[PDB]
Amino acid sequence: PEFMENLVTLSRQGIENLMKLENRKEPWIVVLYAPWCPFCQAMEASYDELADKLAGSGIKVAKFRADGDQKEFAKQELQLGSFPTILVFPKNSSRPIKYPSEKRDVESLTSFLLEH
């Protein structure tokens, strides 16, 4: 039973790719998570819902496990405050934008993007 199954998992190699590749034709939303965090578990279904309703939208929805060895990497470069953090990567953006990670904000995020 894997954690947050609807979201594809970036590796450290993968997300350092995401941040260095540009001409990204598509925006990304990336959840910085850690599978022992209670709020991560309670938000898990909120993120799974986000991913389903955004599937086929052109927005890639992914997750990156940011505890342990990655924790300081995520703290310096990935704007990881505390778990979970939501990073939004626009097509043409100076930097990923940290986005509030509470339930109604996620519902706000989904429904907004659906009207493009």
Quick one: resolution in A? 2.7
Asked if 29 and 87 count as a contact pair (C-beta separation under 8 A), the reply is: yes
Joined together, the tokens standing for residue 33 give 């998570």
- List active site positions: 37, 40
Using the 8-state DSSP alphabet, how is residue 94 labeled?
Answer: S
Distance CA 12, CA 56 (A): 25
Of residues 1, 3, 99, the one with CA closest to residue 44: 3
- Residue reference for tokens 């578990």: 41
Joined together, the tokens standing for residue 96 give 């990923």
- CB neighbours (10 Å) of residue 8? 13
Distance CA 45, CA 57 (A): 19
- Residue reference for tokens 């940290």: 98
Of residues 116, 109, 108, 101, the one with CA closest to residue 42: 101
Q: How far is CA 99 from the centre of its chain?
A: 9
Q: What are phi and psi of 30, to 5 degrees?
A: -130, 125
Instruction: For 1-116, list the strands marked E by DSSP.
Output: 8-9, 28-33, 60-65, 85-89, 97-99
Of residues 99, 69, 68, the one with CA closest to residue 84: 99
